[PDB]
Amino acid sequence: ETATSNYIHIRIQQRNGRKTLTTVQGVPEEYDLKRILKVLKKDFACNGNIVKDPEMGEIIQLQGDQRAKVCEFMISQLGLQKKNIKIHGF
Amino acid sequence: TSHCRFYENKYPEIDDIVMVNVQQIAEMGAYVKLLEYDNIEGMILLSELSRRRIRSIQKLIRVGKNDVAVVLRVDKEKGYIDLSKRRVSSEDIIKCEEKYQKSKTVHSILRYCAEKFQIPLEELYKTIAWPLSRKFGHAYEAFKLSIIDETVWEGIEPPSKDVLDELKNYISAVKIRADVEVSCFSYEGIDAIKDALKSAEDMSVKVKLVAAPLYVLTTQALDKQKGIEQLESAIEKITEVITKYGGVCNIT
Amino acid sequence: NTKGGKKGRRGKNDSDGPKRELIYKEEGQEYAQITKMLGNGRVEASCFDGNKRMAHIRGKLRKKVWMGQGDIILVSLRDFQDDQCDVVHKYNLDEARTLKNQGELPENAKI
Amino acid sequence: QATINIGTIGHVAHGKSTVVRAISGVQTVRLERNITIKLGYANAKIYKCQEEISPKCQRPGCPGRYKLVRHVSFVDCPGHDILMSTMLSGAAVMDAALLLIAGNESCPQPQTSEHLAAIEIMKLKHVIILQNKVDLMREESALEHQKSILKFIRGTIADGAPIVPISAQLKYNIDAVNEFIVKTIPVPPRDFMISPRLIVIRSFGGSILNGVFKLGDEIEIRPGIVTIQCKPIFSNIVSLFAEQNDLKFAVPGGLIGRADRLVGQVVGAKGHLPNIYTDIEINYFLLRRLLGVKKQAKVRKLEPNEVLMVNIGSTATGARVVAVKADMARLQLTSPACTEINEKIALSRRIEKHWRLIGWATIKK
RNA sequence: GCGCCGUGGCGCAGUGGAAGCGCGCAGGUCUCAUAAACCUGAUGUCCUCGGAUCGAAACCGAGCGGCGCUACCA
Ligand SMILES: [Mg+2]
């Protein structure tokens, strides 16, 4: 048995200019990370960067203010659920 | 006033690994207090503070915080310390940290006694920490040895036995985990297990019930390594004593 | 200061005040929350009525008043067309709150 | 040791477990955020004021230590539309029951019915209906419900199945319930001489039905553990316990004693003659409706190569239909069934994701 | 009940004197402006309560919550 709802944290990270960054915390480690990053890069105008945390956690970077759009994209391309998302900041 | 150096001799040696608590930044670097050797002031000249150019000074070094360091220039006459942070090799760092920790622990030991009775601190230092160091190298090692088997305290006498007793108490029952997984599914299996436990627990510790097949006992340790010898005995009992019952038991 | 100080902002002068009178509804003109701020002067803005619409910036505010996401806005709907509509007046946050309190706009969206 | 096995069937949250708590005191532990999930268990002593629950008459009238009539046991089922498969299972141990309807909710509620007809189907004919939550209703409401009840209890087999309204929350009127259950749920004779046979529904546990076990007998469990085959497990009765008190022997009525593995297994005399079938001959009948859910859609006749839950004894097994005649179908099973006698069974189908009781019959060898 | 996390906010780690890292919010500084880049934070002593010992969040207990073991213990 596996938990259906895990806390995925889409945070506000301050990027160059008045612009921001979609940073994802608490990523499910089941699918290939690099592949997902590549997919994300392809779909938007973003660059994918992964910051590694020991034992559990990987910070996934996507340059820009999308949030909802990103979530929609994730929903469209299988690998991540609908309920797992949380917007953090404002 | 409380003072006196961490090690045996008054003055630091060349290429000695230290840990430095940052006081204030000036021009050369910082007038730091060396926490591996007394509290004598020295400096890290702006060239050997970091391996690479890091621009920021108050994030990689930080005022109030400790830094892994090495002593470069020493002048055995009055008191100067030319110091480095860069010359400390990869790894090595861990060792230095450990040493620092040991030193801190040693320091912690030597103040309670003073508090209890005043009397000159230098004398106290002489009669507790130095002879052992001279014999071996570091006081923490000596302490460890004592803990393992009490013989280093017999060498040089403490001011009173009370202090020694207190130290012993501080050092001291230590809980060691012992898990038993009995392969039983029968109705009268639990009872059998209990019976087995009662023949092994007696004559010397704290048995906790988690499940019918799983039983978790905590064994007491008086001198830290005394708990391993009891565990071994218990294990032996499982293989030798529990044979008349015919209950299959497994150890994790 | 307006946005970013600049050498090239002192040749403008803005006059409206924070303590300005709030504008009410008209005929062929109603209130919208902004769905998503689009490009090239276009903007996707869901009306408080119950129609999706496509909103468009018409002059005036094109450089003077900058806008963001999820804002209460006066939209004069096209009388001849319907799908394309135009933004007339941006409402302040305080202003929006006051409107909400009044109950002039339907209570469905948050500031 | 307890004489008899009384079941407490009924819809969900009508308070079945709560009524068990006003009668015995015992809770089923709970499940603590949900509700009863395993069959709950509890016992009690019934004495009577000639001149009760504890050897004490000085509660009403006066002192003369009430005379002990018997010690009974209950089986708290759950109530949830889906725990159907266990409650079925549980009935196999019952010697009678008590239908807890809720006084403040629409009388024939899905599970209430599902249960009721299960009862009239398996054979549990010694029934007492009970109107529970009357402590939260209008003195009119509880009588009109008594009407709908007195009217349901008509065409059906339920002549004078009395209906004793209670308050399981404030333990009110329970003593007239004890008088009902002291009249109508009589304690069946059981020839001991018979083959020692018993059903299992927990293990960390089960009920005897025919025969009697004694401390230190040699015993086996069927079908037992599997390999794919299924072999019997032998052991010696290390001990016998009812409630918290130990006994040297054990006889029908009551429950006796890892996770609950040998669930749906049975225990008999070592060196005894019982079939461990893989394929079985059921004779059978259907309901005309699917009484249970919260919709009454009419029962489709059995098509072969269909998967159906065969509830036999305490066990709950799944199986596929190889033969479809008038009232004799032949079934192929995943997990073997030890058929101790001739027997009763209960047959279900996955109607809309959740399984549903649809018909019954008799095992045949 | 056991084990770790017990915060100065989240998320990561370390045990006997030294306010531990990454992010976030709150605020500053630098630049005409924002971001990066920088510092300072907030319940003052790192679960609740007190003690042995000057002390400490760390040593010890009674008392709570999340999961790593249990399976409902008549
Ligand atoms: Mg001007």
PDB file of C-alpha atoms in Angstrom, chain A:
ATOM      1  CA  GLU A   1       0.000   0.000   0.000  1.00  0.00           C
ATOM      2  CA  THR A   2       1.127   3.535  -0.909  1.00  0.00           C
ATOM      3  CA  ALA A   3      -0.015   7.003   0.229  1.00  0.00           C
ATOM      4  CA  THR A   4      -2.176   8.775  -2.383  1.00  0.00           C
ATOM      5  CA  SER A   5      -1.597  12.349  -1.145  1.00  0.00           C
ATOM      6  CA  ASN A   6       1.937  13.640  -0.508  1.00  0.00           C
ATOM      7  CA  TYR A   7       2.834  17.294   0.144  1.00  0.00           C
ATOM      8  CA  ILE A   8       4.264  18.746  -3.089  1.00  0.00           C
ATOM      9  CA  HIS A   9       5.470  22.289  -2.347  1.00  0.00           C
ATOM     10  CA  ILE A  10       5.471  24.744  -5.274  1.00  0.00           C
ATOM     11  CA  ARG A  11       7.206  27.741  -3.662  1.00  0.00           C
ATOM     12  CA  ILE A  12       7.818  31.391  -4.586  1.00  0.00           C
ATOM     13  CA  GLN A  13      11.552  31.822  -5.269  1.00  0.00           C
ATOM     14  CA  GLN A  14      12.743  35.274  -6.384  1.00  0.00           C
ATOM     15  CA  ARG A  15      14.320  35.303  -9.880  1.00  0.00           C
ATOM     16  CA  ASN A  16      15.994  37.949 -12.115  1.00  0.00           C
ATOM     17  CA  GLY A  17      13.797  41.066 -12.284  1.00  0.00           C
ATOM     18  CA  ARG A  18      10.261  41.203 -10.861  1.00  0.00           C
ATOM     19  CA  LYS A  19      10.048  37.611 -12.200  1.00  0.00           C
ATOM     20  CA  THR A  20       9.924  34.454 -10.019  1.00  0.00           C
ATOM     21  CA  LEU A  21      10.688  30.696  -9.936  1.00  0.00           C
ATOM     22  CA  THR A  22       8.544  27.571  -9.602  1.00  0.00           C
ATOM     23  CA  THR A  23      10.533  25.512  -7.069  1.00  0.00           C
ATOM     24  CA  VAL A  24       9.146  22.063  -6.241  1.00  0.00           C
ATOM     25  CA  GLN A  25       9.832  20.421  -2.851  1.00  0.00           C
ATOM     26  CA  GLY A  26       8.849  16.883  -1.789  1.00  0.00           C
ATOM     27  CA  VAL A  27       9.048  15.171  -5.193  1.00  0.00           C
ATOM     28  CA  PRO A  28       7.898  11.509  -5.609  1.00  0.00           C
ATOM     29  CA  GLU A  29      10.971   9.367  -6.392  1.00  0.00           C
ATOM     30  CA  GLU A  30       9.430   6.773  -8.740  1.00  0.00           C
ATOM     31  CA  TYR A  31       9.931   8.177 -12.267  1.00  0.00           C
ATOM     32  CA  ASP A  32      13.175   9.347 -13.933  1.00  0.00           C
ATOM     33  CA  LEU A  33      13.984  12.890 -12.764  1.00  0.00           C
ATOM     34  CA  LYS A  34      16.143  13.964 -15.697  1.00  0.00           C
ATOM     35  CA  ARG A  35      13.470  12.866 -18.180  1.00  0.00           C
ATOM     36  CA  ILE A  36      10.817  14.869 -16.341  1.00  0.00           C
ATOM     37  CA  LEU A  37      13.106  17.917 -16.298  1.00  0.00           C
ATOM     38  CA  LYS A  38      13.655  17.560 -20.043  1.00  0.00           C
ATOM     39  CA  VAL A  39       9.902  17.303 -20.622  1.00  0.00           C
ATOM     40  CA  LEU A  40       9.327  20.445 -18.556  1.00  0.00           C
ATOM     41  CA  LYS A  41      12.018  22.292 -20.518  1.00  0.00           C
ATOM     42  CA  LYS A  42      10.398  21.240 -23.789  1.00  0.00           C
ATOM     43  CA  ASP A  43       6.857  22.287 -22.758  1.00  0.00           C
ATOM     44  CA  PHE A  44       7.695  25.770 -21.412  1.00  0.00           C
ATOM     45  CA  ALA A  45      10.560  28.294 -21.622  1.00  0.00           C
ATOM     46  CA  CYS A  46      12.112  26.937 -18.393  1.00  0.00           C
ATOM     47  CA  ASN A  47      15.459  25.385 -17.438  1.00  0.00           C
ATOM     48  CA  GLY A  48      15.488  22.405 -15.054  1.00  0.00           C
ATOM     49  CA  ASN A  49      17.853  22.231 -12.069  1.00  0.00           C
ATOM     50  CA  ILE A  50      17.826  19.678  -9.233  1.00  0.00           C
ATOM     51  CA  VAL A  51      19.222  20.448  -5.765  1.00  0.00           C
ATOM     52  CA  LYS A  52      19.901  17.216  -3.842  1.00  0.00           C
ATOM     53  CA  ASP A  53      18.984  16.687  -0.175  1.00  0.00           C
ATOM     54  CA  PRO A  54      20.285  13.691   1.888  1.00  0.00           C
ATOM     55  CA  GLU A  55      17.937  10.703   2.512  1.00  0.00           C
ATOM     56  CA  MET A  56      14.671  12.394   1.378  1.00  0.00           C
ATOM     57  CA  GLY A  57      13.964  15.437  -0.805  1.00  0.00           C
ATOM     58  CA  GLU A  58      14.994  16.976  -4.130  1.00  0.00           C
ATOM     59  CA  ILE A  59      14.475  20.675  -4.930  1.00  0.00           C
ATOM     60  CA  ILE A  60      13.239  20.911  -8.552  1.00  0.00           C
ATOM     61  CA  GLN A  61      13.770  24.324 -10.200  1.00  0.00           C
ATOM     62  CA  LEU A  62      11.705  25.838 -13.026  1.00  0.00           C
ATOM     63  CA  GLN A  63      12.413  29.498 -13.950  1.00  0.00           C
ATOM     64  CA  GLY A  64       9.188  31.558 -14.005  1.00  0.00           C
ATOM     65  CA  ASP A  65       5.712  32.367 -12.707  1.00  0.00           C
ATOM     66  CA  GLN A  66       3.353  29.630 -13.942  1.00  0.00           C
ATOM     67  CA  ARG A  67       2.196  27.561 -10.903  1.00  0.00           C
ATOM     68  CA  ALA A  68      -1.323  26.681 -12.085  1.00  0.00           C
ATOM     69  CA  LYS A  69      -0.067  26.212 -15.652  1.00  0.00           C
ATOM     70  CA  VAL A  70       2.698  23.904 -14.404  1.00  0.00           C
ATOM     71  CA  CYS A  71       0.147  21.894 -12.415  1.00  0.00           C
ATOM     72  CA  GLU A  72      -2.067  21.582 -15.496  1.00  0.00           C
ATOM     73  CA  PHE A  73       0.895  20.377 -17.550  1.00  0.00           C
ATOM     74  CA  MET A  74       1.752  17.799 -14.885  1.00  0.00           C
ATOM     75  CA  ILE A  75      -1.869  16.585 -14.902  1.00  0.00           C
ATOM     76  CA  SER A  76      -1.734  16.267 -18.694  1.00  0.00           C
ATOM     77  CA  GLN A  77       1.515  14.214 -18.706  1.00  0.00           C
ATOM     78  CA  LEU A  78       1.248  11.140 -16.419  1.00  0.00           C
ATOM     79  CA  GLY A  79       3.583  10.805 -13.416  1.00  0.00           C
ATOM     80  CA  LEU A  80       2.017  13.154 -10.839  1.00  0.00           C
ATOM     81  CA  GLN A  81      -1.455  13.439  -9.250  1.00  0.00           C
ATOM     82  CA  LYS A  82      -4.021  16.280  -8.838  1.00  0.00           C
ATOM     83  CA  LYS A  83      -4.378  16.382  -5.014  1.00  0.00           C
ATOM     84  CA  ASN A  84      -0.638  16.478  -4.158  1.00  0.00           C
ATOM     85  CA  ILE A  85      -0.019  20.160  -5.064  1.00  0.00           C
ATOM     86  CA  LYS A  86       0.439  23.137  -2.708  1.00  0.00           C
ATOM     87  CA  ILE A  87       1.207  26.773  -3.630  1.00  0.00           C
ATOM     88  CA  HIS A  88       3.582  28.465  -1.152  1.00  0.00           C
ATOM     89  CA  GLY A  89       4.222  32.201  -0.779  1.00  0.00           C
ATOM     90  CA  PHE A  90       1.291  34.502  -1.597  1.00  0.00           C
TER      91      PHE A  90
END
